[PDB]
Scaffold this motif. Structure first.
Motif, PDB file in Angstrom:
ATOM      1  N   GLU A  52       2.670 -10.037  27.192  1.00  0.00           N
ATOM      2  CA  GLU A  52       2.338 -10.485  25.841  1.00  0.00           C
ATOM      3  C   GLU A  52       2.394  -9.239  24.956  1.00  0.00           C
ATOM      4  O   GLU A  52       1.725  -8.243  25.237  1.00  0.00           O
ATOM      5  CB  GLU A  52       0.938 -11.115  25.796  1.00  0.00           C
ATOM      6  CG  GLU A  52       0.710 -11.989  24.561  1.00  0.00           C
ATOM      7  CD  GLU A  52      -0.664 -12.658  24.527  1.00  0.00           C
ATOM      8  OE1 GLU A  52      -1.088 -13.219  25.563  1.00  0.00           O
ATOM      9  OE2 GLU A  52      -1.310 -12.637  23.455  1.00  0.00           O
ATOM     10  N   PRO A  74      -6.249  -0.980  22.958  1.00  0.00           N
ATOM     11  CA  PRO A  74      -7.284  -1.478  23.866  1.00  0.00           C
ATOM     12  C   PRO A  74      -6.988  -1.258  25.333  1.00  0.00           C
ATOM     13  O   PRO A  74      -5.851  -0.976  25.724  1.00  0.00           O
ATOM     14  CB  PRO A  74      -7.347  -2.977  23.550  1.00  0.00           C
ATOM     15  CG  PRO A  74      -6.510  -3.145  22.265  1.00  0.00           C
ATOM     16  CD  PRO A  74      -5.457  -2.098  22.429  1.00  0.00           C
ATOM     17  N   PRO A  75      -8.023  -1.375  26.170  1.00  0.00           N
ATOM     18  CA  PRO A  75      -7.833  -1.198  27.608  1.00  0.00           C
ATOM     19  C   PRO A  75      -6.779  -2.206  28.056  1.00  0.00           C
ATOM     20  O   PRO A  75      -6.611  -3.244  27.420  1.00  0.00           O
ATOM     21  CB  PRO A  75      -9.216  -1.524  28.170  1.00  0.00           C
ATOM     22  CG  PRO A  75     -10.133  -1.008  27.084  1.00  0.00           C
ATOM     23  CD  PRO A  75      -9.454  -1.499  25.830  1.00  0.00           C
ATOM     24  N   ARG A  97       2.601  -7.065  21.008  1.00  0.00           N
ATOM     25  CA  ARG A  97       2.084  -6.930  19.653  1.00  0.00           C
ATOM     26  C   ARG A  97       2.809  -5.751  19.012  1.00  0.00           C
ATOM     27  O   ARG A  97       3.125  -4.762  19.685  1.00  0.00           O
ATOM     28  CB  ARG A  97       0.582  -6.618  19.656  1.00  0.00           C
ATOM     29  CG  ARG A  97      -0.321  -7.685  20.243  1.00  0.00           C
ATOM     30  CD  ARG A  97      -0.551  -8.845  19.284  1.00  0.00           C
ATOM     31  NE  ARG A  97      -1.531  -9.767  19.849  1.00  0.00           N
ATOM     32  CZ  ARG A  97      -1.273 -10.639  20.818  1.00  0.00           C
ATOM     33  NH1 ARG A  97      -0.053 -10.732  21.333  1.00  0.00           N
ATOM     34  NH2 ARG A  97      -2.249 -11.399  21.296  1.00  0.00           N
ATOM     35  N   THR A 126       0.718  -6.568  27.339  1.00  0.00           N
ATOM     36  CA  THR A 126      -0.200  -6.711  28.453  1.00  0.00           C
ATOM     37  C   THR A 126       0.617  -6.670  29.728  1.00  0.00           C
ATOM     38  O   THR A 126       1.840  -6.796  29.690  1.00  0.00           O
ATOM     39  CB  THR A 126      -0.916  -8.057  28.409  1.00  0.00           C
ATOM     40  OG1 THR A 126       0.053  -9.107  28.546  1.00  0.00           O
ATOM     41  CG2 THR A 126      -1.666  -8.220  27.094  1.00  0.00           C
ATOM     42  N   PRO A 127      -0.046  -6.490  30.877  1.00  0.00           N
ATOM     43  CA  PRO A 127       0.685  -6.450  32.143  1.00  0.00           C
ATOM     44  C   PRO A 127       1.557  -7.697  32.292  1.00  0.00           C
ATOM     45  O   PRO A 127       2.602  -7.665  32.939  1.00  0.00           O
ATOM     46  CB  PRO A 127      -0.434  -6.395  33.178  1.00  0.00           C
ATOM     47  CG  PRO A 127      -1.493  -5.606  32.470  1.00  0.00           C
ATOM     48  CD  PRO A 127      -1.477  -6.207  31.082  1.00  0.00           C
ATOM     49  N   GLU A 128       1.126  -8.795  31.678  1.00  0.00           N
ATOM     50  CA  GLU A 128       1.869 -10.047  31.753  1.00  0.00           C
ATOM     51  C   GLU A 128       3.025 -10.136  30.763  1.00  0.00           C
ATOM     52  O   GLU A 128       3.820 -11.077  30.813  1.00  0.00           O
ATOM     53  CB  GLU A 128       0.927 -11.234  31.547  1.00  0.00           C
ATOM     54  CG  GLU A 128      -0.054 -11.450  32.694  1.00  0.00           C
ATOM     55  CD  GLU A 128      -1.094 -10.350  32.797  1.00  0.00           C
ATOM     56  OE1 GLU A 128      -1.837 -10.145  31.814  1.00  0.00           O
ATOM     57  OE2 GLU A 128      -1.173  -9.693  33.861  1.00  0.00           O
ATOM     58  N   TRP A 151      -3.566  -2.356  27.789  1.00  0.00           N
ATOM     59  CA  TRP A 151      -2.297  -2.481  27.074  1.00  0.00           C
ATOM     60  C   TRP A 151      -1.365  -1.283  27.202  1.00  0.00           C
ATOM     61  O   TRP A 151      -1.785  -0.133  27.073  1.00  0.00           O
ATOM     62  CB  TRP A 151      -2.525  -2.722  25.574  1.00  0.00           C
ATOM     63  CG  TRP A 151      -3.212  -4.008  25.194  1.00  0.00           C
ATOM     64  CD1 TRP A 151      -4.553  -4.280  25.272  1.00  0.00           C
ATOM     65  CD2 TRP A 151      -2.603  -5.163  24.611  1.00  0.00           C
ATOM     66  NE1 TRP A 151      -4.814  -5.530  24.762  1.00  0.00           N
ATOM     67  CE2 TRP A 151      -3.633  -6.097  24.345  1.00  0.00           C
ATOM     68  CE3 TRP A 151      -1.283  -5.504  24.279  1.00  0.00           C
ATOM     69  CZ2 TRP A 151      -3.394  -7.344  23.767  1.00  0.00           C
ATOM     70  CZ3 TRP A 151      -1.037  -6.755  23.701  1.00  0.00           C
ATOM     71  CH2 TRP A 151      -2.092  -7.656  23.450  1.00  0.00           C
ATOM     72  N   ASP A 187      -7.748   0.565  32.447  1.00  0.00           N
ATOM     73  CA  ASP A 187      -8.707   0.064  31.465  1.00  0.00           C
ATOM     74  C   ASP A 187      -9.145   1.118  30.441  1.00  0.00           C
ATOM     75  O   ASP A 187     -10.118   0.937  29.717  1.00  0.00           O
ATOM     76  CB  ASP A 187      -9.933  -0.546  32.165  1.00  0.00           C
ATOM     77  CG  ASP A 187     -10.815   0.491  32.821  1.00  0.00           C
ATOM     78  OD1 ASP A 187     -10.421   1.672  32.873  1.00  0.00           O
ATOM     79  OD2 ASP A 187     -11.912   0.118  33.295  1.00  0.00           O
ATOM     80  N   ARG A 188      -8.404   2.213  30.374  1.00  0.00           N
ATOM     81  CA  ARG A 188      -8.704   3.286  29.431  1.00  0.00           C
ATOM     82  C   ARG A 188      -8.044   2.969  28.093  1.00  0.00           C
ATOM     83  O   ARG A 188      -6.894   2.545  28.053  1.00  0.00           O
ATOM     84  CB  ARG A 188      -8.158   4.616  29.964  1.00  0.00           C
ATOM     85  CG  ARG A 188      -9.178   5.480  30.677  1.00  0.00           C
ATOM     86  CD  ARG A 188      -9.989   4.710  31.702  1.00  0.00           C
ATOM     87  NE  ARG A 188     -10.925   5.598  32.384  1.00  0.00           N
ATOM     88  CZ  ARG A 188     -11.974   5.190  33.085  1.00  0.00           C
ATOM     89  NH1 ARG A 188     -12.232   3.891  33.209  1.00  0.00           N
ATOM     90  NH2 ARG A 188     -12.773   6.083  33.652  1.00  0.00           N
ATOM     91  N   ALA A 189      -8.765   3.175  27.000  1.00  0.00           N
ATOM     92  CA  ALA A 189      -8.206   2.901  25.680  1.00  0.00           C
ATOM     93  C   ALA A 189      -7.576   4.167  25.105  1.00  0.00           C
ATOM     94  O   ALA A 189      -7.579   5.217  25.746  1.00  0.00           O
ATOM     95  CB  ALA A 189      -9.292   2.396  24.757  1.00  0.00           C
TER      96      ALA A 189
END
Ligand code: 6PG
Ligand code: 6PG
Ligand code: FE
Lengths: 185, 187
Positions: B117, B132-133, B119, B113-115, B135, B95-97
């Protein structure tokens, strides 16, 4: 999941796209500069802008980050260089990193123990502000001093102590840049 | 308590080098199983095993609230038609940015994302990217010159390269008459 994003920083103006702009004039810094007279004068003379901040901050959360550029304008109150108010972090434990982008100045840091350090900054200079150190930025040049600052989103801001006690040093012009003790510290 | 001393270090805008920083080098041979065209990968390794990127880092002890920073010089090139890129990773404390500030060249950042998704955010001199956290992120050089940037991250963020070295990213960044972000076949 929050959305990642990109924003453009203008190396010439110091302005960050889509950032939250804040402005601080002399009238917003009463009780900071040594020369209270010269201060009062300049205020009535026009109350010039000392610095402006362009910030993009997240909600107060551990592990997250905020960043912002500061455009510290050239000038002096008496013979004391224009500067930011200076502050500790609410979570004093938090560190911070500055990256000088334009102009020239320096950062004055101080610990709760009383230690004081002054680090000169020029474009390209990266300043590491350790945990527990209060810090203030000074413009020692005749042109705007621009820098980017990055800090923990949960660091918080503690100005009170500084507005009260003040830094143990002042940065003044005496032909050259002189770092000397602060009388009312 | 005894406090740590503050300090100033010089970053060379042209070279991306930070004085007194810890240097790391990653050659193509250090990225086995990262690129889709493994045959093109093999050929390039034997032909010279070029440096993909170099990192100049200054880190503190992994403690809460502290900060690390580092520059990366990501060299131009392609494996097959896949642009040179960093290995990519999630933070250990996920969760660290992280914040990137591009200084030279042209490129972009791939995040997911872990899933899975994803960008893709383009980067040029002056671009600041907020990671962001949660990613994962990988930087890509889509130009013909070195892509240089500064990154700032929590000193306790750590690094998680495993998942990515294993499954890679859900997307790849290639050149087809232009820069295209397509699905990763082996993902
Ligand atoms: O928290 C921040 O946003 C950064 O530390 C920096 O942007 C700082 O705020 C400005 O330089 C104004 O100076 P002061 O906040 O110390 O008065
Ligand atoms: O942790 C760090 O030091 C920063 O995120 C950054 O300097 C990163 O390491 C490089 O861009 C290489 O990318 P990889 O670490 O994913 O190989
Ligand atoms: Fe990292």
């Amino acid at each position: 999941y929050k959305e990642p994003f990109g924003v453009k920083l203008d190396f010439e103006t110091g302005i960050i796209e889509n950032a939250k702009k804040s402005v601080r004039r002399l009238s917003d810094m009463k009780g900071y500069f040594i020369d209270e007279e010269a201060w009062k004068k300049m205020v009535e003379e026009g109350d010039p802008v000392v610095y402006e901040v362009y910030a993009i901050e997240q909600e107060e959360k551990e592990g997250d980050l905020n960043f912002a550029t500061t455009v510290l304008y050239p000038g002096k109150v008496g013979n004391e260089f224009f500067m930011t108010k200076g502050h500790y972090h609410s979570k004093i434990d938090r560190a911070e990193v500055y990256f000088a982008l334009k102009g020239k100045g320096g950062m004055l840091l101080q610990t709760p123990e009383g230690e004081a350090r002054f680090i000169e900054m020029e474009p390209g200079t990266i300043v590491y502000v350790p945990p527990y150190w209060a810090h203030r930025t000074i413009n020692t040049g005749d042109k705007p001093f621009i820098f980017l600052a990055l800090y923990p989103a949960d660091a918080g801001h503690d100005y009170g102590t500084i507005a009260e006690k003040g830094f143990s040093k002042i940065v003044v012009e005496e032909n050259g840049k002189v770092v000397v003790k602060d009388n009312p510290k």
